[PDB]
Backbone:
């Protein structure tokens, strides 16, 4: 896979309290905008994924409409969150 | 503990897609009201717990104000959701 080693590392161990910008697909700049919106921790963003019943179209529009992420960035967060759930929830 | 065997069974294996009324503290009648509110699965309610950063006062008021659960029923869901997270998330 051409994804960063973080993608395989995140889906290989608990997420604990790592910062939101730790999720694959979210860069340092995007992490700051979400933090200003009340998502200072990744587990709060994980909850939004659960609220959307894992719907990929609703999840991608939520991130793009919420911060302006590009279509490529949204694909990395979906598979990243979907794969973590496959291992944990 | 005087809790139902479901409490120990729920915190002993994944929650999968079991119905919301499966969470300890939620009875069949309370499960129906949440379902009408869009929580047809327990993992959608688990997400609300994550959104409240596990705050016990905010979580209990959410359930009581959301369905009318009693103070005793709210205590069972908090420890039930908090213990599940301790084993999984």
Residues:
């Amino acid at each position: 896979m051409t994804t960063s080693q973080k993608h395989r590392d995140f889906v290989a161990e608990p997420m604990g309290e790592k910062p939101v910008g730790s999720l694959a697909g979210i860069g340092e700049v995007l992490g700051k905008k979400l933090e200003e919106r009340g998502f200072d921790k990744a587990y709060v963003v994980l909850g939004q994924f659960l609220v959307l019943k894992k719907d990929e179209d609703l999840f991608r529009e939520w991130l793009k409409d919420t911060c302006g992420a590009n279509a490529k960035q949204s694909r990395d967060c979906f598979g990243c969150l979907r794969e973590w759930c496959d291992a944990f929830l």
